[PDB]
C-alpha cells in the first residue's frame, strides 16, 4: 500500500505494465525521464506529448490511467484526513 509519492522509477514502471499494458512501447520513456511517483502526480497531457507520446489515442489512454491513479491516491488521502479529523 505504498503511497504514490514514495514510488521509485522502478515502481512506476511496474505500475505502467499493469495499467498501460497495451502501450508497452512508451514504457522506456518513463524510465529515461526519471518519472518517479512524485513526477507521476505532476505529469499532464502536455508533458506526455513533450516526452514523445505523439499518438492522440495512445496518449489519451495513458493520460487517463495517470488521472485515475491520482483519484485513487486522492481517495486514500481523503480517508487519512478523515481519520485525522476524528482522532
Amino acid at each position: 500500500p505504498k503511497a504514490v509519492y514514495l514510488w521509485t522509477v522502478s515502481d512506476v514502471l511496474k505500475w505502467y505494465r499493469r495499467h498501460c499494458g497495451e502501450y508497452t512501447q512508451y514504457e522506456q520513456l518513463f524510465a529515461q525521464h526519471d518519472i518517479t511517483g512524485r513526477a507521476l502526480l505532476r505529469i499532464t497531457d502536455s508533458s506526455l506529448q513533450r516526452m514523445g507520446v505523439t499518438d492522440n489515442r495512445d496518449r489519451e489512454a495513458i493520460w487517463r490511467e495517470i488521472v485515475k491513479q491520482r483519484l485513487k491516491t486522492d481517495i486514500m488521502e481523503i480517508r487519512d484526513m478523515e481519520r485525522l479529523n476524528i482522532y
Partner: protein, 264 residues
C-alpha cells in the same frame, strides 16, 4: 529580509541543491547562465531545457518546488483560511462550468483531482491551531471531507448518472467554501501569516515534512506545534527534502536561528 526575487544566482543554486540529489548535475548551468531569483520564480519548462534539464521528472522537481516558493514569496498576506476557501470555490465553480454518457471525460476526471487538491491546504489548516480544537471548525472539516470523498468516489465510479451527481457535489463544495467566505465572522480566517525569527542556543521539537517539502514543528518556547520552518540560519528551505533539512539543522551547531511562519 527574505526577498526571493533579489536572490543572486549563488542563492538560487544554494536553494536548488536542497530539492533532490538529482539537482546536483544542473547547478553548474544555473550559475553559468546566471539564473537569479526573478528568473527562478518565473522559470518555465523550456528554460529548464535550455539549462540542459531534459528529463521531465527532473523538471517537475524544480517546478513543484518553485510553485511552493512562489506562494511563500508572493501571497504570504493571503496565507489564511479565507483565501484557501476561495481557491476551493474557484476550482469547484470551474468543475461546474466544465460539466455544462456512462464514461466520464478524462478532462472532467482531471478537474476533479485539481479540485480535490485545493482541499488539502484548507483541511491541513483546519487540523492545526487555532481551528483544530474548535467544535465548529472540526464539523466544517468533516463536511468538506465528506463532500470531497463524494466527488472522488463518484469519479472513480466506486459509487447511473455520473455527470449530474458530480455537478451536485461541485455545487455543495462551492457552498461549503462560501461558508468561510460569507458566513464566518471569525477574524482568524482573514488573518495574514507572519514571519518570526526564533534563536535557539540549545530544542526538543521534531520536524514533520510533507511530501512536497513543507516542514512543520511537531512533538514539542517561542515555537508552537504546527509552525512552519521556512529558513534555517537564513537559508530558505521551503521545498527541500526532509533529509537535507535535518542535515542542515543538525550541522547548524548549538546556535541556530529559525525563520518560522506562525499560526493565527
Amino acid at each position: 529580509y527574505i526577498n526571493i526575487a533579489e536572490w543572486t544566482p549563488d542563492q538560487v543554486t544554494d536553494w536548488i541543491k536542497g530539492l533532490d540529489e538529482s539537482m546536483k548535475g544542473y547547478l553548474y548551468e544555473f550559475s553559468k547562465q546566471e539564473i537569479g531569483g526573478r528568473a527562478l520564480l518565473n522559470i518555465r519548462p523550456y528554460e529548464l531545457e535550455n539549462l540542459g534539464m531534459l528529463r521531465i521528472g527532473h523538471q517537475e522537481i524544480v517546478l513543484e518546488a518553485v510553485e511552493n516558493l512562489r506562494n511563500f514569496h508572493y501571497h504570504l498576506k493571503n496565507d489564511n483560511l479565507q483565501f484557501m476557501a476561495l481557491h476551493v470555490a474557484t476550482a469547484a465553480k470551474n468543475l461546474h462550468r466544465e460539466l455544462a454518457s456512462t464514461k466520464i471525460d478524462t478532462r472532467i476526471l482531471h478537474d476533479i483531482t485539481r479540485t480535490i487538491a485545493t482541499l488539502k491546504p484548507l483541511v491541513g489548516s483546519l487540523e492545526r491551531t487555532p481551528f483544530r480544537k474548535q467544535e465548529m471548525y472540526r464539523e466544517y472539516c468533516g463536511n468538506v471531507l465528506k463532500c470531497g470523498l463524494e466527488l472522488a468516489t463518484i469519479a472513480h465510479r466506486d459509487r447511473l448518472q455520473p455527470v449530474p451527481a458530480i455537478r451536485q457535489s461541485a455545487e455543495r463544495l462551492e457552498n461549503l467554501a462560501n461558508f468561510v467566505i460569507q458566513d464566518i465572522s471569525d477574524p482568524m480566517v482573514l488573518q495574514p501569516a507572519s514571519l518570526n525569527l526564533v534563536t535557539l542556543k540549545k530544542l526538543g521539537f521534531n520536524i514533520e515534512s510533507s511530501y512536497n517539502g513543507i516542514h512543520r514543528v511537531t512533538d514539542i518556547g517561542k515555537i508552537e506545534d504546527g509552525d512552519e520552518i521556512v529558513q534555517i540560519n537564513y537559508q530558505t528551505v521551503v521545498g527541500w527534502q526532509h533529509r537535507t533539512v535535518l542535515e542542515h539543522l543538525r550541522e547548524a551547531l548549538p546556535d541556530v536561528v529559525l525563520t518560522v511562519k506562525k499560526r493565527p
